[PDB]
Design a protein around this ligand. Structure first.
Ligand SMILES: CN(C)CC(C)(C)COc1ccc2[nH]c(-c3cc(NC(=O)c4cnn(Cc5ccccc5)c4)c[nH]c3=O)cc2c1
Length: 257
């Protein structure tokens, strides 16, 4: 029962690959992340995580240069692949995935962890299309012994990143994750990213601050989810909506399909 057949390749990453592995006896699947050993922290963070919208960590094995992490298998693949270019997806599915993303993110924040790289490539779908947050490689602790520390390393992926992280030496962790979730929502409902980065050097970002919502991607989005996006994609992180308030939003609580 301790033996696993590496069946299929799942994902190349920078540092590794991810293999479907199946158990010889039980036929259980796992995803196996394989790296030429950042990683100490990733394992350490994963060890603290236990939630239905976070990819389960099963364990690790040293093997000299090669680090193995054994991770929950999500047969649905990446949310990224459910987003049709230029269209997105049906609004009820976007809503359900967003509900689950917030559940995952609430959980992480409640234990003082920030993911710092939320995007569709990192949101996995299990067999019943349940969304799971993956890839704790950029994640870090922002609250410890009930004291918040401010972040100052710039980490993430530029189209998903909050504007305060390009402009401020220090910033709060939670609003940043909130922002990226908003860019994820936008992608789900429009099938495109609104900007390369949230700077006034990008015209699409200037246009959004000038409320030009008759332009794309905003014109493809119904008025109710767009009103939520108006509260999330707010340049000042202190005025940006918080998760407890997202859970009170009208579209968030709209019955759909
Ligand atoms: C492109 N596609 C049309 C090709 C096709 C093969 C159809 C992809 O379809 C699937 C289907 C199911 C999948 N499941 C997984 C998976 C991925 C992870 N990954 C992670 O948890 C993690 C942790 N860190 N990273 C990024 C990384 C990876 C390697 C090295 C460094 C960083 C990823 C954990 N569990 C999974 O189950 C990927 C995956 C892909």
């Amino acid at each position: 029962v301790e033996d696993w057949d590496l069946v299929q390749t799942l994902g190349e990453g920078a540092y590794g690959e991810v293999q479907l592995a199946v158990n010889r006896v039980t036929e259980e699947a796992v995803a196996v992340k394989i790296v030429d050993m950042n990683i100490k922290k990733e394992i350490c963070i994963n060890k603290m995580l236990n939630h239905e919208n976070v990819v389960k960590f099963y364990g690790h094995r040293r093997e000299g240069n090669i680090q193995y992490l054994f991770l929950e298998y999500c047969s649905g693949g990446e949310l990224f692949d459910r987003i049709e270019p230029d269209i997105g997806m049906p609004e009820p599915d976007a809503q359900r995935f967003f509900h689950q993303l917030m559940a995952g993110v609430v959980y992480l924040h409640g234990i003082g962890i920030t993911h710092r790289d939320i995007k569709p490539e990192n949101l996995l779908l299990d067999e019943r299309d349940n969304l799971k947050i993956s890839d704790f490689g950029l994640a870090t602790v922002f609250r410890y012994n009930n004291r918040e520390r401010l972040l100052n390393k710039m980490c993430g992926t530029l189209p998903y990143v909050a504007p305060e992280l390009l402009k401020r030496r220090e910033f709060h962790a939670e609003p940043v994750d909130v922002w990226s979730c908003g860019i994820v929502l936008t992608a789900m409902l429009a099938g495109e990213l609104p900007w390369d980065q949230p700077s006034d050097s990008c015209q699409e970002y200037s246009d959004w601050k000038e409320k030009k919502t008759y332009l794309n991607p905003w014109k493809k989005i119904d008025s109710a989810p767009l009103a939520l996006l108006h509260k999330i994609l707010v340049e000042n992180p202190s005025a940006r909506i918080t998760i407890p308030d997202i859970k009170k939003d009208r579209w968030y609580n709209k019955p759909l399909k």
